[PDB]
Design a protein around this ligand. Sequence first.
Ligand SMILES: *[C@@H]1O[C@H](CO)[C@@H](O[C@@H]2O[C@H](CO)[C@@H](O)[C@H](O)[C@H]2NC(C)=O)[C@H](O)[C@H]1NC(C)=O
Ligand SMILES: *[C@@H]1O[C@H](CO)[C@@H](O)[C@H](O)[C@H]1NC(C)=O
Ligand SMILES: [Cl-]
Lengths: 549, 190
Amino acid sequence: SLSCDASGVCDGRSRSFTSIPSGLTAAMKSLDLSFNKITYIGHGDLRACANLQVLILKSSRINTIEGDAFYSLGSLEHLDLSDNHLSSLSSSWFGPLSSLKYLNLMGNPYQTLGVTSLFPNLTNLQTLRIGNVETFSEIRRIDFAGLTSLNELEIKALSLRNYQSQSLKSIRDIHHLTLHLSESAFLLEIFADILSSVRYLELRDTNLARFQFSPLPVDEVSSPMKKLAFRGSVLTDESFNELLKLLRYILELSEVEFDDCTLNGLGDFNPSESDVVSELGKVETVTIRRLHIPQFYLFYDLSTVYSLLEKVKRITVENSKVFLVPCSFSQHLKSLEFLDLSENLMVEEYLKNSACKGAWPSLQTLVLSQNHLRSMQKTGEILLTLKNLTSLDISRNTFHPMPDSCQWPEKMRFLNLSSTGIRVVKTCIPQTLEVLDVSNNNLDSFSLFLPRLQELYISRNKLKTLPDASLFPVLLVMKIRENAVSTFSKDQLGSFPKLETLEAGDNHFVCSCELLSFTMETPALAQILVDWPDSYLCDSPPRLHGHRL
Amino acid sequence: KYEDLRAYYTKPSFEFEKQFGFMLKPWTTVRFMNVIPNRFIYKIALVGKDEKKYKDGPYDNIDVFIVLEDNKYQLKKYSVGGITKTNSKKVNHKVELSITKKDNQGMISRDVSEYMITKEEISLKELDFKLRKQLIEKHNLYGNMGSGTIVIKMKNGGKYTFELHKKLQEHRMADVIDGTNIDNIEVNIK
Ligand SMILES: *[C@@H]1O[C@H](CO)[C@@H](O[C@@H]2O[C@H](CO)[C@@H](O)[C@H](O)[C@H]2NC(C)=O)[C@H](O)[C@H]1NC(C)=O
Ligand SMILES: *[C@@H]1O[C@H](CO)[C@@H](O)[C@H](O)[C@H]1NC(C)=O
Ligand SMILES: [Cl-]
């Protein structure tokens, strides 16, 4: 009822097993027993697979496991017990798993990790996941006893009732800590215990409206934390300020993210200049996605944000209904080098103010993909204010046909026009371009002379002929999949003098001797075509249809 | 008795040129125009002829004369009317300001000064407010006396009149006139 391959990888997934299947062997290296109905696991059910390296028992209905059930799994490296029905954990289970690297106990209705440390012998553990939405309510100092270093630690404690002080402090290093907290009640206690270990902190679903700061024990060395992210949090202008005060403890913080967050209240907070945080330390990257401001009304004093983003080099604000970056605000971002405003509401009329005379002085890369831009001509003219812009992405914008004449930033060498619905390319596009992406459009041909072009992306278009080499005397890379070419003679191939990489795959070809002879004569061009011959299937005739070369 | 007028017409005023005006989600009964010359988002109510005048916008190259006041919506940065088109050319158009005052002891005095017009298009809001303040500071308007008129005389006859015993009607603050067509100004305080 189960099938294994030649590498000892056996599939017993989505079966109706009510117990571990019999006749397992020492030749088995991987076992997938997910989506089953194994209510009970006995002492010898898994004794035969002494060489098992991977054990997935995800989504079964496991409610009982004998203490010594894993006695012979000394070679096990991966144990996934997520989404099961284990309401109690036994330290006996993990004792013989000295080689264990990944352990998932998340999604089980247990209230605690037990009265006995579960992991003191998992010396090789790198990843640990625990907790649940409804019942996990307490963290004790012994819970994580024995762990020195972890790459990823995820703790779901949305229903946490008590955290024993110094519990998280025993872990020396944690590259990525994910915390699911519904309230901010224990945030300060937890934070204090992770200043020396966590390199990347992620907070999910936390309501921080009631959060209030208070001085933490200043300690010996600096925090190794480089990234801090908030996911699904709720903030107020007041509480947001309180959070910033934590920055004094993570002086090496370089990146901050706010994803799917909500900012409530009106827009007035009016504090003294002392409770206001105006410094952002060494943070150079700020990333915001799907931010909801349900009452963007009473808000009026943007300057606190001016000192916050003063020394910031990278900013991302995705899918957050942005329609305007005020000129005066744009002029204050003197250090900004990268700005991403994808999936917003930018239109030329508002963009003219955002990229006003003096806006984003140091900007090098600007991404305006999937906005409401309609005109390439007016847009290039508007962006002329950006003297250092070198890369522009205006993909996923519905542009009207382009004209013969256009003005663009003098240093612009990269341009993304993917998915703009264009049918023709005209001299609007500057010859200063080194990289051009015009994929996923409606082009029937390409006749634009670009003397400096090194890379052209034009996949998913309607070209029936690879474009003339003379249009690109120095092209290095060309990707033209999902188009409409069918032949590719040696002449045109050798025509590009500097060409290195070509992607003609996933196309519809005609299968003729006049071509096949060329295929056999020089397979030395297999080092110019990627995904060859995987994606180079034929179409005609019906005999060779869907057959590789 | 004239304490309210003196308080209002001694408020600080703000003026900004070449501003970018925009409209938001109309959250209350009266639409607002927003400008951010620096770091403050200013909300300016659209009343009177401005309701017809401004639609979805955006509106570039506007000047604003702003006076901040107590209001219902509890906004902290709110002025009313006073929106005009910015100068196309620089203007220094000097006009005569005459001031007649009949004091508490029936004595009639007449004084004169010059008033510098610097805008091609100027709001009644701006003229009313600045002139009354000048009259308050220098001629004790709303001290013992708080009646009479300000009259803006245009070169081709027309008049714009501000009655001093009460605040300027709200809708007229959006009313704009040709700054370069003002001939003179006559004040009569009594
Ligand atoms: C130009 O932009 C497009 C999209 O705006 C990029 O194409 C892909 O977009 C999808 C979005 O559905 C992403 O998932 C992919 O990662 C994107 N890249 C690829 C290679 O598929 C495209 O990559 C951009 N061009 C360049 C040169 O960066
Ligand atoms: C380009 O970036 C430099 C970086 O310091 C900045 O000083 C300058 O103002 C920007 N613009 C020009 C025209 O150099
Ligand atoms: Cl809008």
